[PDB]
Amino acid sequence: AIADVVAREYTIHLHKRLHGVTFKKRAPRAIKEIKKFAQKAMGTSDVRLDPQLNKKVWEQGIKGVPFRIRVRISRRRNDEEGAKEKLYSYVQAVNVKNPKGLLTSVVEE
RNA sequence: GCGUGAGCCCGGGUCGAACGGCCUCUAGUGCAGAUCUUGGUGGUAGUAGCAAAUACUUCAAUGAGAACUUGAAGGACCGAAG
Ligand SMILES: [Mg+2]
Ligand SMILES: [Mg+2]
Ligand SMILES: [Mg+2]
Ligand SMILES: [Mg+2]
Ligand SMILES: [Mg+2]
Ligand SMILES: [Mg+2]
Ligand SMILES: [Mg+2]
Ligand SMILES: [Mg+2]
Ligand SMILES: [Mg+2]
Ligand SMILES: [Mg+2]
Ligand SMILES: [Mg+2]
Ligand SMILES: [Mg+2]
Ligand SMILES: [Mg+2]
Ligand SMILES: [Mg+2]
Ligand SMILES: [Mg+2]
Ligand SMILES: [Mg+2]
């Protein structure tokens, strides 16, 4: 019985998703993979990436995407009256030096 | 419906201002071709294709509608015979 408004932290293993893709498409493909990951995790289909997360993805150039990335995905209410979906997932990067050895963890203020 | 035939006449529809039969006279008088002339239109066919010049991404604004509008941020190229 997970409440709509919920936030978790995940480790996305981007290495196995970007394995073998064209160098000029590595970072955009990682962006799309992050969006798809949030879609699968929160069942929301409306995913918004933090510009800090975009900076973290593009930090090492177009083909230097990190093997793992620690993110926080927060499913929250879309209050816009014209919204086709009632919920959206906003995903940002977690301030950690390395993402190794971390489990999926629920986060609450 | 008539004529072997070229054709002729009528019914119905559309349409809107002229036209026909008979005897003579006259000719720029009869088309499937000429890689014919001009114009229009097909199959091919939603097909060939839209692949040189390294490359785009996130958020926001605008807007009926945004990859190729703009702002910010990031990532890149031209690399002083630019
Ligand atoms: Mg390969
Ligand atoms: Mg009149
Ligand atoms: Mg003639
Ligand atoms: Mg002809
Ligand atoms: Mg002939
Ligand atoms: Mg012609
Ligand atoms: Mg043609
Ligand atoms: Mg094609
Ligand atoms: Mg070509
Ligand atoms: Mg193409
Ligand atoms: Mg090109
Ligand atoms: Mg608007
Ligand atoms: Mg472009
Ligand atoms: Mg060069
Ligand atoms: Mg250079
Ligand atoms: Mg000089």
Q: Is the CB of A59 under 7 A from strand B?
A: yes
Question: Residue A88: which H helix or E strand, with range?
Answer: strand A87-93
List the beta bridge partners of residue A9: A72, A105
A71 half-sphere exposure, CB direction, 13 A CA radius: 31
Ligand 1 geometric centre to CA of A22 (Å): 8
User: Which ligand is nearest to the Cα of residue A28, counting in written order?
Assistant: 13
Q: Closest nucleotide to residue A53 (Cα to C1')?
A: B58
Deposited resolution, Å: 2.2
3-state SS assignment for residue A26: helix
Burial A54-67 (b: 16+ CB within 10 A, else e): eebbbeeeeeebbe
Provide the pairing of β-strand A47-49 with A87-93: parallel
Q: Is residue A6 exposed (0-12), middle (13-18) or buried (19+ Cβ within 10 Å)?
A: middle
User: Which ligand is nearest to the Cα of residue A80, counting in written order?
Assistant: 12
Which bases of strand B have any atom within 7 Å of the beta carbon of a protein residue? 54-60, 72-76
Q: Is residue A91 exposed (0-12), middle (13-18) or buried (19+ Cβ within 10 Å)?
A: buried
Q: Is the CB of A31 under 7 A from strand B?
A: yes
CA neighbor of A47 nearest in space, from A88, A6, A106: A88
How far apart (Å, rounded) are the C-alpha atoms in residues A97 and A46?
A: 29
CA neighbor of A71 nearest in space, from A49, A88, A87: A49
- Cα of first residue to Cα of last residue in chain A, in angstroms, is 20
Q: Are A78 and A85 in contact (CB under 8 A)?
A: yes
Torsion of CA A53, A67, A65, A59, to 10 degrees: 50
How far apart (Å, rounded) are the C-alpha atoms in residues A41 and A95?
A: 21
Handedness of CA A26, A31, A32, A33 (dihedral sign): positive
Residue type, A83: A
